[PDB]
C-alpha cells in the first residue's frame, strides 16, 4: 500500500557533488563563472518557452481574420526579440562547453577516487554494526582537504598529491572507530576498492577462498598447493617452485616476506608475493598483509595514532556527538 523510495547517492551522482565543492574550493572564479552561465541558459530556456507561448494564442484567439490583425503583424517583431536571445544562447552554449570541460574535468579523476572511498567504507558496516558513518562528516573532512591543501605546485601535478594526502586523513578518521583486529581488514578491503589493476585476474577469487609434482616442501602446504595450481595455472607454472633452489633460502627465513627471491622480484606482481606466502607459509601472512598494505598506502604501520583525548577534542564541535 506504499511506494518504497530510496535516495542513496550513486558513485556517478556523488562524484559530481564532490566536483561542485572542489570547483568552489580551488578557485572562486570557476564556480561563480560556471554557475551564472547555466542560469542564463535556463532563463533563455524560459524565454524560449515564451516565444513558443505566442504561437498557440494566435490561431486560437480569433479563429478568423488572422491575416487582418495588427497584433499578429507585431508578433513578427517579437520573433526577432526571441531570435536575438536564441542566437545569444547558441553562442553562450557553445562557448562554455569546450572551456568549462577543461575547468571541470581537471578535478574528476580525483573525485572518482574520492567516490571510491565513500562506497568502500560504507560496506564496513556490514561486518560490524556501528560501523556506519555520516555522509556529512565525510564532506566536512573533504572540506578539510582544501583547508589543509597548502602545496606550491602545478595543478595537474597537485591533484595526485591531494588524493595521497587525503587517503591518510581518511584512514585516520576511520581508524578511530576500528577495532584492532578489523583495522587490517579495513586496510585491505580499502585497498581493493581503490585499485583493481593489481589484482588483475581472479587471483583474488582464489586467495579469498571462494601434489605429485613437489618433493622438498611441507605436506600441509602441499594440499594447499594442489588447490593453488588448479585455480591459477599461469602463475603456478611461472613461479618455478619446482626449481626449488631460490625457494630453499626464502623458505627458511623467518621474516621471509622481506627477502623475496631477487630474480623473480621484477617478474612477479607486488600482490602476487602474498599469494605466495599464503600457500607457502601461513607463518608470515599476518605480517605480509600488513607490510603490503603499509606499502600501498604509504603508512609504515597499519595501526593509527594513539588515542589521547585532548588532542582529539580539537576536532570536535557542538554540532555532532562524541561516541566511545
Amino acid at each position: 500500500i506504499v511506494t518504497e523510495v530510496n535516495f542513496t547517492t550513486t558513485r556517478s551522482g556523488l562524484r559530481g557533488q564532490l566536483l561542485a565543492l572542489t570547483i568552489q574550493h580551488e578557485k572562486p572564479d570557476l564556480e561563480e563563472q560556471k554557475t551564472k552561465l547555466l542560469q542564463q541558459e535556463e532563463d533563455k530556456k524560459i524565454q524560449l518557452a515564451k516565444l513558443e507561448e505566442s504561437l498557440l494564442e494566435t490561431l486560437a484567439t480569433s479563429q478568423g481574420n488572422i491575416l487582418e490583425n495588427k497584433d499578429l503583424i507585431e508578433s513578427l517583431n517579437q520573433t526577432k526579440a526571441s531570435s536575438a536571445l536564441i542566437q545569444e544562447s547558441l553562442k553562450e552554449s557553445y562557448k562554455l562547453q569546450i572551456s568549462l570541460d577543461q575547468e571541470r574535468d581537471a578535478y574528476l579523476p580525483l573525485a572518482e577516487s574520492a567516490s571510491k572511498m565513500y562506497f568502500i567504507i560504507s560496506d564496513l558496516s556490514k561486518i560490524n554494526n556501528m560501523y556506519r558513518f555520516s555522509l556529512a562528516a565525510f564532506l566536512r573532512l573533504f572540506q578539510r582537504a582544501l583547508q589543509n591543501k597548502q602545496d606550491s605546485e602545478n595543478t595537474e601535478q597537485r591533484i595526485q598529491s591531494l588524493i595521497s594526502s587525503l587517503q591518510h586523513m581518511v584512514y585516520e578518521y576511520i581508524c578511530r572507530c576500528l577495532f584492532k583486529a578489523d583495522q587490517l581488514m579495513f586496510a585491505l578491503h580499502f585497498v581493493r576498492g581503490m585499485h583493481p589493476e593489481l589484482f588483475q585476474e581472479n587471483e583474488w577469487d582464489t586467495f579469498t577462498g571462494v601434489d605429485q609434482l613437489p618433493s622438498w616442501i611441507d605436506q600441509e602446504r602441499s594440499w594447499a598447493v594442489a588447490t593453488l595450481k588448479i585455480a591459477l595455472p599461469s602463475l603456478y607454472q611461472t613461479l618455478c617452485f619446482e626449481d626449488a633452489a631460490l625457494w630453499r633460502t626464502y623458505y627458511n627465513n623467518s621474516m621471509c616476506e622481506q627477502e623475496f627471491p631477487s630474480i623473480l622480484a621484477k617478474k612477479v606482481s607486488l600482490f602476487q608475493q602474498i599469494l605466495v606466502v599464503q600457500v607457502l607459509r601461513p607463518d608470515r601472512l599476518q605480517s605480509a598483509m600488513a607490510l603490503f598494505a603499509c606499502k600501498t598506502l604509504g603508512l609504515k604501520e597499519v595501526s593509527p595514532l594513539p588515542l589521547n583525548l585532548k588532542r582529539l577534542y580539537k576536532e570536535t564541535l557542538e554540532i555532532e556527538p562524541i561516541l566511545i
Binding site: 542513496t8 550513486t10 551522482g13 559530481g16
Partner: peptide, 10 residues
C-alpha cells in the same frame, strides 16, 4: 534537486 540520475529517477 541533486543532479544525480537516481534523483532524476526518484
Amino acid at each position: 534537486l541533486p543532479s544525480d540520475d537516481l534523483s532524476i529517477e526518484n
